[PDB]
Amino acid sequence: LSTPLQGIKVLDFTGVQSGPSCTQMLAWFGADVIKIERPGVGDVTRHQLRDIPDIDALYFTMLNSNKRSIELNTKTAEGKEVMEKLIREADILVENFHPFTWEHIQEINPRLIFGSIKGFDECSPYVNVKAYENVAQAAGGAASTTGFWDGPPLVSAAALGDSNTGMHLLIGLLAALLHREKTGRGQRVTMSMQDAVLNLCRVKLRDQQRLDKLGYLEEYPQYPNGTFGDAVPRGGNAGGGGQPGWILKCKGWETDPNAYIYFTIQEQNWENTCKAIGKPEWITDPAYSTAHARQPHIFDIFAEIEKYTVTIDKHEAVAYLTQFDIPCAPVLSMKEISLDPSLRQSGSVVEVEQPLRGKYLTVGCPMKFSAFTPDIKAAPLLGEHTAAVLQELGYSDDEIAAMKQNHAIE
Amino acid sequence: LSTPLQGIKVLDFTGVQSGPSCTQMLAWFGADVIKIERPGVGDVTRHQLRDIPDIDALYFTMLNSNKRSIELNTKTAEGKEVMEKLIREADILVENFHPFTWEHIQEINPRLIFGSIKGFDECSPYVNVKAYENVAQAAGGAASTTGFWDGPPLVSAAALGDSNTGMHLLIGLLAALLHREKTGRGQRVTMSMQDAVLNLCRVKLRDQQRLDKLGYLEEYPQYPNGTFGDAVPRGGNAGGGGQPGWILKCKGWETDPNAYIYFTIQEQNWENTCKAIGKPEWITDPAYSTAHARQPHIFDIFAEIEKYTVTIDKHEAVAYLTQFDIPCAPVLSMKEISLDPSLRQSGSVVEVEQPLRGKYLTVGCPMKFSAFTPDIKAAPLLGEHTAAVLQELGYSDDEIAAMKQNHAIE
């Protein structure tokens, strides 16, 4: 009967993934999101990585559910007029362009919130450098600290520079809406891809300061028989926090790249872990009884657990080990996730009917609310809503026809 | 003169990283965040990974800036009474416990928003399984798709299961505050670590569907001379989207694990890339002139670029290549980030004075606002605000003294 963003109007210039992920969520929260697209071309994701000739790619449909699409040429007298009318009516304008002024917009509409995503902050030496996903992962600390100590920096499959940056801009936009309830004014909100990556790497900045102070990191694989340099090193599949763990092979790993589990050695669970793996002697042995004592031979311990896990299927391994309250889970493949019934039931993976394509899967709205449920719908066809939007703005049918004709002739 | 969450009152039961990251942001947006801690012990991060004996760890100070701390024993008659008074006054209650009912809370305070983080959704077969960071990375798709095709699943340094889950809960809480402006009611908001990871891996679900349809992924390293299985494979340092790229060695890589850059081959920038690397012949050569043509020998191309990058310092490499509008950046180490002047100027890395410790660095508020600037402050000492909070609740000095005495005796 009501949604959080009921009545909110968004002008959405975003493309690719960072900005569209943000505005897709705005739409799912009830906002009217109008994608303003280049006539005859549209968002680049419509044409990238297509699996079916001549129809919008999955890259597009999974990021643009529930949006409206207009085609608009701002470089004409009528396009500029349409743009001004849209700005007067809008609550939020969002853009994520590579490197109508804000001053003018404020004068047109002092209630408007302007959201902008860039690769880097305004004062960065890299302010004018184009960033894609992995460029941000490199600049933000993640590639440096992900991977193995004897291998290269490694990018993460997770969209640390793209969807993550979108989620951070979304936080800012919702805060700005809340602030507007108090001030009656909009404002500018900016978010950089580098900063989004850094925020998720906060704990690696913790580790850099520990390393600066002490010269070693007790819980890292390099302690005590390896070497530390001046910067936090890659730790392979180490825990990353106060509880050690590792990725362990399960039955079938020679041919199945996802036949593995993650296993945590939780400090407060040590006795239960010992019972699980048939090592009751390790409950009181001073070399094993505390985390500090375990650390210098922690890989011998993981090797002992792996002697068991390699003999059974990962799902069996987790079923057995969790009886002992061990934090662990299988490494789920994208195929397993795409078919998991619980993720359908939770609305985490959602089937959507798309015009011209038929069914596709998307990731749904991740957080759950007791007072409303988003209804996830198809993505817009290019320019599907141009006429409807112009009508809502007060243009007559003859005026709309004239605009379309002028465009066709130009 | 005003902040977005001015006057909002938060009761914060969270510990470790997911929940505290969320409520730290609430505090930075102006909310009063009261951490409710176990007497004599407090949040586990106070004592984990310490670098200085007997004072709060950096793990704690970098996640609990600007909060208040009370020590409260809910298992006594007076503790339950304090708890009820706090709930009556609060806007938001947040918890992230491992696996006062909601029904009762709604009756006490129909305006209260209750936020909860768990490892898994309520209908998951894993609902009762403990999750740490990397357990969620395994269950959410990220470990499966991160790393190399001939190596194990790999965890990301970025806190995909922890701070990322916090940011998603934060989105939900701000949406619920906006919804409350319309309904006059609070609600429950829930977020799972598995779902947070999956949301950042949306593009790998795109790829799984493409793979299901076609049997290959044209832009992955395995095309065309490798093999595809049933699930999206690890792609090493591949682009992840519509623009190919790779991590390339720079001068010093034999001894410096961060002597590398990320380099993107941007489709619309191919001629400029050719000019950059001294290969004008590749502008019109049909084997190189289009992305489709480049893909089968893309690693020969990266090898040619690396013949240049290996000869100069990464920062020199980026200075040269960006003149040609190539999207690229150095792999910045945590040491470089910790000292970068631009990140201080932008408020992305922030120096804070902590009682008993002195100066530490934290990651600041990532998004920037034109209408307010957060002031990032010290973390609370354990129980620092117990008396102040009890006074605000209307307890007399004699009552507070009696509560402290009763506790000391018990």
Swiss-Prot record, chains A, B:
Classification via InterPro entries: CoA-transferase_III_domain, CoA-Trfase_fam_III, CoA-Trfase_III_dom3_sf, CoA-Trfase_III_dom_1_sf, Formyl_CoA_transfer
Recorded coiled-coil stretches: none
Pfam families: CoA_transf_3 (PF02515)
Record: residues binding substrate: 241-243
Phenotype of null mutants: Cells lacking this gene show a reduced acid tolerance response (ATR) during the adaptation phase. However the deletion of YfdW has no effect on survival in oxalate-containing challenge medium.
Binding of CoA, residues: 17-18, 38, 72-75, 96-98, 130-133, 266-268
Enzyme active site: 162 (nucleophile)
Catalytic activity, reaction form: formyl-CoA + oxalate = oxalyl-CoA + formate; formyl-CoA + succinate = succinyl-CoA + formate
Involved pathway(s): Metabolic intermediate degradation; oxalate degradation; CO(2) and formate from oxalate: step 1/2
Keyword tags: Transferase
Keyword Transferase: yes
Expression induction or repression: By the acid response regulator EvgA.
Class of enzymatic activity (EC top level): transferase
Keyword Transferase: yes
EC number of the protein: 2.8.3.16
Example GO biological process: cellular response to acidic pH
Molecular-function annotations in GO: formyl-CoA transferase activity
Family stated for the protein in its record: Belongs to the CoA-transferase III family. Frc subfamily.
Quaternary structure and interacting proteins, as annotated: Homodimer.
HAMAP family linked to this entry: Formyl_CoA_transfer
Function: Involved in the catabolism of oxalate and in the adapatation to low pH via the induction of the oxalate-dependent acid tolerance response (ATR). Catalyzes the transfer of the CoA moiety from formyl-CoA to oxalate. It can also use succinate as an acceptor.
PANTHER family in alphabetical order: SUCCINATE--HYDROXYMETHYLGLUTARATE COA-TRANSFERASE
The name this protein goes by in its record: Formyl-CoA:oxalate CoA-transferase
Gene name in the database record: frc
